Amino acid sequence: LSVHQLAAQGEMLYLATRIEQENVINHTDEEGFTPLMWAAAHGQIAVVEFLLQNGADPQLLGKGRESALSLACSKGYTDIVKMLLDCGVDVNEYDWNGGTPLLYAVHGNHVKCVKMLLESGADPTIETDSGYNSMDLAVALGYRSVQQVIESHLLKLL
């Protein structure tokens, strides 16, 4: 099983073995995804920790500029988001799908993730090419708790 797959399944033994045999920790697949990205996408906290501790680069992006952060944000994997935020990744980066970590957190109704992003410097007034920001999206989708967190943050700034 590829290192990506071992990561996605949380197969700590086989994954730890493989990092010994070959230097493959940052090896990308066809879509530019690192094992770390696969681990983030599947909410494998233990694996994410293992990978970061063993040289995995959290800033590496997919072909469509996908990030480990946005992948974890989109699913509401709060514990992984914290870890990656603590790596010092950019919070405000866009991908080709026009999404940012905040927009994916908002889209998924992940209130805790939204709070965490905003506290890490994610800017809720940055817009997609369509002209809507994170507040707009929260209002559009009817996510009232998410709306309040964003509005509260904005209010404290002004």
Partner: peptide, 11 residues
């Protein structure tokens, strides 16, 4: 294959 949701896209 890890996937992100398609987000709203306005004309």
């Amino acid at each position: 294959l890890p996937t992100l949701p398609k987000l709203p896209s306005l004309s």
